Amino acid sequence: KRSEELSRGFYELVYPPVDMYEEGGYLVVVADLAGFNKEKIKARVSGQNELIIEAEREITEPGVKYLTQRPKYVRKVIRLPYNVAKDAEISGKYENGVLTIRIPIA
Amino acid sequence: YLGKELQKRSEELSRGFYELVYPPVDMYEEGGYLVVVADLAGFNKEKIKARVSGQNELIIEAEREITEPGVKYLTQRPKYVRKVIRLPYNVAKDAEISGKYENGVLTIRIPIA
Numbered sequence: 001k002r003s004e005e006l007s008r009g010f011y012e013l014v015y016p017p018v019d020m021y022e023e024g025g026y027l028v029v030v031a032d033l034a035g036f037n038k039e040k041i042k043a044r045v046s047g048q049n050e051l052i053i054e055a056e057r058e059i060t061e062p063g064v065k066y067l068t069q070r071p072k073y074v075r076k077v078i079r080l081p082y083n084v085a086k087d088a089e090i091s092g093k094y095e096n097g098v099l100t101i102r103i104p105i106a
Numbered sequence: 107y108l109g110k111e112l113q114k115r116s117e118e119l120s121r122g123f124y125e126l127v128y129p130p131v132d133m134y135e136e137g138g139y140l141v142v143v144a145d146l147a148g149f150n151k152e153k154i155k156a157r158v159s160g161q162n163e164l165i166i167e168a169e170r171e172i173t174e175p176g177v178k179y180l181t182q183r184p185k186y187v188r189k190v191i192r193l194p195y196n197v198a199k200d201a202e203i204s205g206k207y208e209n210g211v212l213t214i215r216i217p218i219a
Contacts (some may be wrong), residue, residue, distance in 0.1 A: 001108075002107075003191070003192070005107070006107055006127065008130075010107075010127075011127070013112060014124070015130065015145075017121075017183045017184065018180050018182050018183070019172070019174060019180055019182060020178070020179045021174050021176040021177060021178045022176045022177055022179075023175060023176040030174075030183065031183075032146075032147035032148050032183055032210070034146060034147035034148075035209055036209075061132055061134045061143075062134065062136050063134040063135045063137075063141070064134060064135050065132070065133075065134045066133045066134060066194050067131050067132055067133040068132055069131050070130045070131070070132050070143065070144075070145050078116070078180065081179045096147060096148050096149075096210050097145070097146070097147025097209050097210010098147045098148040098210065
């Protein structure tokens with residue numbers, strides 16, 4: 001329960017936090033994913049009902065490390081509420097550390 | 107910190123759960139400064155407040171509105187954040203702390219006493 005005991009590994013299992021809602025015929029997924037290179041963020045729908053968000057970064061921090069919680073790697077699987085066009089392509093934007101993915105349901 | 111919650115459906119991992127662990131922070135000491143780096147995506151810089159209390163506690167606080175029209179399937183992003191970090195060195199009782207916020211990352215440098 002100690003804060004120094006909450007590790008990068010712990011955070012990988014819960015990170016990034018994500019909201020998902022339906023709007024105007026799209027499933028919208030918003031993730032707080034601060035501190036990544038946009039080109040190292042991958043999102044894909046596998047099957048018809050599964051969004052996978054993957055990301056990686058290098059973290060190099062000098063000096064003596066007292067806390068190390070920020071995940072170097074991220075892989076978040078999100079079950080969509082229902083099938084999305086088997087091959088419905090997705091759009092994504094990354095701003096202020098927030099990744100927004102829109103997936104057409106149509 | 108229970109991993110017991112780690113076994114629930116993602117849907118049951120609520121904003122309140124993430125409030126208790128968010129943001130993740132790295133902290134290290136370099137050259138007489140304590141450096142704190144927080145993943146704090148999607149806030150207004152001016153709604154981010156960091157202050158030292160006593161001589162060895164950093165509190166990082168922030169708030170935002172989240173407007174999400176439509177039926178929600180997942181609601182994990184915290185609207186409120188309050189992270190308390192115990193500093194391993196004492197900090198100038200009367201000193202300033204500078205911060206920068208870029209790509210959702212808050213970096214705070216604090217002079218070591």
